[PDB]
Ligand binder design. Structure first.
Ligand SMILES: [Mg+2]
Ligand SMILES: [Mg+2]
Lengths: 335, 323
């Protein structure tokens, strides 16, 4: 039995965590969740104890913590503090077209590897004179090499063929230039993988017209934010895609789009797919591959059934009805 | 009958620019064309290029070759506001058909401050600059644009959750202009939310106002929804009433003089130009003539019909005559 940190988060986080536990029970998953809450408190003790809990358990499943952007700059994103404190350097999401979820594009199969600790998320800002604000985007060789190594290794291990570095090196000559140069050094050690690069604006144009051209994509922090959400949208939205955050030792799992979803919270309409797929992802990481495969086949099979669809993908079903169907699919798998 | 500075540019630049002049005359527009070739010299743009624009106020620009001339023009004329109206085009069919969005990009600062430092070996700092003055001005323009073009909603797009002090200040200036302009409906949205929703239901968005990089990227994404850079207008508003309207696609050198080019974008930028000054009547005619031509079928260009540039141009002229 494994002990895994669970951080319910805000909005749809807590309600979906209950369904994760419920699904884990029916599948007899040898996992015990140790819950840690993070309030809206300006004080950091909550987010620090959560870090401590993940340091101990090494693995976590979390909902999204709301960032109040009206508070002073001293009050920093708790999701970001967490991400960067634990040095979870690789944000990884897999956007794949689901046969049961018909959107404007099909045959999308994209692995996005996003630098997850650096860049425009460095929280370095100051006001030199009144009304003049500077924000410091930090790009380093160590972290750019690190994320490129990850993307190429992933591409090779999962039998992918192309890695596309996404950047703005034509304008951000030194910063994005360094990121790209680091990707290129790694590319020389993976001669069997096609390496390409694309400016981030053009990338978004290509994604909304011919997203089938992309295989693995690697990029710094903000561009990952953008591309993740574009690709998540192309395949059907926030309710479908799981996100992983990998460090050398720790790992934290969530939904790809990192959305609070406060406007649909507590209405039994949230799509449970992304969160459940994230928990399978976590089970694989824990080497509980058979449990991961049971649940993942159950949730994917339920998504084939239009009747099980929640409103976010144009259905009319409730969350609990989707879970009912997922559980129905599981208890015939394990007898 | 006022004069418009014309910058044909390179490659297909002359061809398409000729096509726009032919259509503007066929519509009997009170505009005469004052051609000017910009080129960086001494850097700076030529004496006669600067001078035409300084008295005329209005320019039209085809695709240029690549000190960037587009960067020069921005600093020379303080082009602070990039405007890109993306409207889904009937006949030319993408997977998105309900699009009607204006992206308003702060064009002077933000993450294009031009300031990068090597802090130590293997550590680079790129400075994102957000100022009170520049943010208020783009916000004032965004709301002023909305009123004048009969637009209900303005959305400020930001990442103030992550960049609190900088995107926050930009937002604070957007809020101050908004409360002093209760006419237009104002909301705030995270950049990632905008991106997520845009590719699902782009019909929900109206006027998007944002700092430089977000604007740089979204203007391109929105253009990708409606067909590309080949069919998309663009305007740049500056200081002292100067304004340049432009093509943003390539020069396409490999078809430069084969009567094989598409002037839709340059035309739509020209239509956009007529609206800015106040000649709303003519603007509507040429536009409807253009849209009906594309909807019509065979008169199409190669990127769009197995037809030449000059037929397509000729059909539009013909149709704008029969208002
Ligand atoms: Mg969030
Ligand atoms: Mg752009």
């Amino acid at each position: 039995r494994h002990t895994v940190t669970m951080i319910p988060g805000d909005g749809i986080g807590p309600e979906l965590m209950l369904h994760v536990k419920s699904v884990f029970r029916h599948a007899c998953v040898p996992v015990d969740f140790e819950e840690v809450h993070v309030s809206s408190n300006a004080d950091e003790e909550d987010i620090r104890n959560a870090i401590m809990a993940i340091r101990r358990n090494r693995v976590a499943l979390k909902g999204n913590i709301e960032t109040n952007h009206n508070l002073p700059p001293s009050h920093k994103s708790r999701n970001n503090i967490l991400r960067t404190s634990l040095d979870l350097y690789a944000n990884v999401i897999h956007c794949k077209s689901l046969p049961g979820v018909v959107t404007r594009h099909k045959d999308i199969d994209i692995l996005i590897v996003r630098e997850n600790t650096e860049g425009e998320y460095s929280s370095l800002e100051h006001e030199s004179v009144a009304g003049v604000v500077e924000s410091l985007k930090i790009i380093t060789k160590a972290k750019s090499l690190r994320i490129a190594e990850y993307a190429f290794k992933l591409a090779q291990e999962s039998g992918r063929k192309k890695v596309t570095a996404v950047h703005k090196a034509n304008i951000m000559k030194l910063g994005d230039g360094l990121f790209l140069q680091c990707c290129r050094e790694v590319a020389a050690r993976y001669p069997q993988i096609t390496f390409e690069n694309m400016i981030v604006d053009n990338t978004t144009m290509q994604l909304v017209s011919r997203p089938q051209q992309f295989d693995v994509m690697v990029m710094p922090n903000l561009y990952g934010n953008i591309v993740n959400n574009v690709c998540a949208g192309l395949v059907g939205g926030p309710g479908l895609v799981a996100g992983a955050n990998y460090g050398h030792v720790y790992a934290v799992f969530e939904t790809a789009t990192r959305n609070t979803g406060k406007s649909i919270a507590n209405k039994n309409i949230a799509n449970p797919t992304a969160t459940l797929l994230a928990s399978c992802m976590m089970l694989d990481h824990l080497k509980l591959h058979s449990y991961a495969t049971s649940i993942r086949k159950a949730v994917l099979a339920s998504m084939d059934n239009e009747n099980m669809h929640t409103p976010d993908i144009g259905g009319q079903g409730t969350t609990s009805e989707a879970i009912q169907d997922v559980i129905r699919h599981i208890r015939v798998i394990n007898g | 009958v006022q004069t418009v500075t014309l910058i044909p540019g390179d490659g297909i630049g002359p061809e398409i620019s000729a096509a726009v002049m032919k259509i503007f005359d066929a519509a009997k527009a009170p505009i005469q064309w004052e051609e000017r070739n910009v080129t960086a010299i001494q850097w700076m743009i030529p004496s006669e290029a600067k001078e035409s624009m300084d008295k005329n106020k209005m320019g039209l620009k085809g695709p240029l070759k690549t000190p960037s001339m587009n960067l020069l023009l921005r600093k020379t004329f303080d082009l602070y506001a990039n405007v890109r109206p993306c409207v889904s085009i009937e006949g030319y069919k993408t997977p998105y058909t309900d699009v009607n969005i204006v992206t308003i990009r702060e064009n002077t600062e933000g993450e294009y401050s031009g300031i990068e430092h090597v802090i130590v070996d293997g550590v680079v700092q790129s400075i994102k600059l957000i100022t009170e003055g520049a943010s208020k001005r783009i916000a004032e323009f965004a709301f002023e644009y909305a009123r004048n073009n009969h637009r209900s909603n303005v959305t400020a797009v930001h990442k103030a959750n992550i960049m609190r002090m900088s995107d926050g200040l930009f937002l604070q200036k957007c809020r101050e202009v908004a409360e002093s302009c209760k006419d237009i409906k104002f909301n705030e949205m995270y950049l990632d939310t905008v991106c997520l929703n845009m590719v699902q239901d782009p019909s929900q968005f109206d006027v998007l106002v944002m700092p430089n990089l977000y604007g740089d990227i979204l203007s391109d994404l929105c253009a990708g929804l409606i067909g590309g850079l080949g069919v998309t207008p663009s305007g740049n508003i500056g200081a002292n009433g100067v304004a340049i309207f432009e093509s943003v696609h390539g020069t396409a050198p490999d078809i430069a003089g084969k009567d094989m080019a598409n002037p839709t974008a340059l035309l739509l930028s020209a239509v956009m130009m007529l609206r800015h000054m106040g000649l709303f009547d003519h603007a509507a005619r040429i536009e409807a003539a253009c849209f009906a031509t594309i909807k019509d079928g065979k008169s199409l260009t190669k990127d769009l019909g197995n037809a030449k540039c000059s037929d397509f141009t000729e059909e539009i002229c013909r149709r704008v005559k029969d208002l």
